[PDB]
């Protein structure tokens, strides 16, 4: 799975433990993220079906998996998902993370990890997506990640790390995982985050 390969890259870069935790996959487009979380020992995964596409029946039938049928990731609540979770992962298309972060933060326990996949092609403004539907300007990709991190900090969630996804989008966009925590000993300073973003952008996938 391509979705599988990318999340493993994030999990290993950030050293986030999955075993025995309750998880939310906020845009379960593929079975990819859910499968990875189950393989790495998650106690429970809530897979939010937030659009077109149907999760495989082998997955929903799994005793560790619950599928939610929902309009919008924006509509997720801890009540709807059965309580706050320890790990939130989010691979969402055609929406800016700014608009959905409050919902994701609302579903997270205060010692949770929230790890969105920042997709510059849905964070930049009109005229800033280049030929082929790709953000070619590395400065704009960097500014996209920083803007999401700024919005997260406004909600009280600090940035702990940044990692380029190991696989570009199908049109070639490079995308970046952002590791967020509200309870942490290791929150990045502004300079720490700028350094992390510059390295991620320069390293690429």
Swiss-Prot record:
<keyword id="KW-0354">Hemolysis</keyword>
<comment type="function">
    <text>Acts as a host evasion factor, that significantly contributes to the pathogenesis of M.tuberculosis by modulating adaptive immune responses by inhibiting host-protective Th1 and Th17 cytokine responses as well as autophagy. Catalyzes the 2'-O-methylation at nucleotides C1409 in 16S rRNA and C1920 in 23S rRNA. Is likely involved in ribosomal biogenesis. Also exhibits hemolytic activity in vitro, by binding with and oligomerizing into host cell membranes.</text>
</comment>
<dbReference type="GO" id="GO:0008168">
    <property type="term" value="F:methyltransferase activity"/>
</dbReference>
<dbReference type="GO" id="GO:0005737">
    <property type="term" value="C:cytoplasm"/>
</dbReference>
<keyword id="KW-0800">Toxin</keyword>
<keyword id="KW-0808">Transferase</keyword>
<dbReference type="GO" id="GO:0016020">
    <property type="term" value="C:membrane"/>
</dbReference>
<keyword id="KW-0694">RNA-binding</keyword>
<keyword id="KW-0949">S-adenosyl-L-methionine</keyword>
<keyword id="KW-1043">Host membrane</keyword>
<keyword id="KW-0472">Membrane</keyword>
<dbReference type="GO" id="GO:0020002">
    <property type="term" value="C:host cell plasma membrane"/>
</dbReference>
<protein>
    <recommendedName>
        <fullName>16S/23S rRNA (cytidine-2'-O)-methyltransferase TlyA</fullName>
        <ecNumber>2.1.1.226</ecNumber>
        <ecNumber>2.1.1.227</ecNumber>
    </recommendedName>
</protein>
<dbReference type="GO" id="GO:0031640">
    <property type="term" value="P:killing of cells of another organism"/>
</dbReference>
<dbReference type="GO" id="GO:0090729">
    <property type="term" value="F:toxin activity"/>
</dbReference>
<dbReference type="GO" id="GO:0003723">
    <property type="term" value="F:RNA binding"/>
</dbReference>
<keyword id="KW-1032">Host cell membrane</keyword>
<keyword id="KW-0204">Cytolysis</keyword>
<dbReference type="GO" id="GO:0006364">
    <property type="term" value="P:rRNA processing"/>
</dbReference>
<keyword id="KW-0690">Ribosome biogenesis</keyword>
<keyword id="KW-0964">Secreted</keyword>
<comment type="subunit">
    <text>Can form oligomers on macrophage phagosomal membranes.</text>
</comment>
<dbReference type="GO" id="GO:0005576">
    <property type="term" value="C:extracellular region"/>
</dbReference>
<keyword id="KW-0134">Cell wall</keyword>
<keyword id="KW-0963">Cytoplasm</keyword>
<comment type="similarity">
    <text>Belongs to the TlyA family.</text>
</comment>
<keyword id="KW-0843">Virulence</keyword>
<keyword id="KW-0489">Methyltransferase</keyword>
<keyword id="KW-0698">rRNA processing</keyword>
<dbReference type="GO" id="GO:0032259">
    <property type="term" value="P:methylation"/>
</dbReference>
């Amino acid at each position: 799975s391509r979705g599988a390969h990318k999340l493993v890259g994030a999990l290993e870069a950030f050293a986030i433990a999955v075993a025995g935790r309750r998880c939310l996959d906020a845009g379960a487009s593929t079975g990819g993220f859910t499968e990875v979380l189950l393989d790495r020992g998650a106690a429970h995964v809530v897979a939010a079906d937030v659009g077109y596409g149907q999760l495989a029946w082998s997955l929903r039938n799994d005793p560790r998996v619950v599928v939610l049928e929902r309009t919008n990731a924006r509509g997720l609540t801890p009540e709807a998902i059965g309580g706050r979770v320890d790990l939130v992962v989010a691979d969402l298309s055609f929406i800016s993370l700014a608009t959905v972060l409050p919902a994701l933060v609302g579903c997270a326990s205060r010692d949770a990890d929230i790890v969105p996949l920042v997709k510059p092609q849905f964070e930049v403004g009109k005229g800033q997506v280049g030929p082929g539907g790709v953000v070619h300007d590395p400065q704009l990709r960097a500014r996209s990640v920083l803007a999401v991190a700024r919005r997260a900090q406004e909600l009280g969630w600090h940035s702990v790390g940044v990692k380029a996804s190991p696989l570009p989008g199908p049109s070639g966009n490079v995308e970046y995982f952002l590791w967020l925590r509200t309870q942490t000993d290791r929150a990045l300073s502004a300079k720490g985050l700028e350094d992390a973003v510059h390295r991620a952008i320069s390293e690429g996938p």
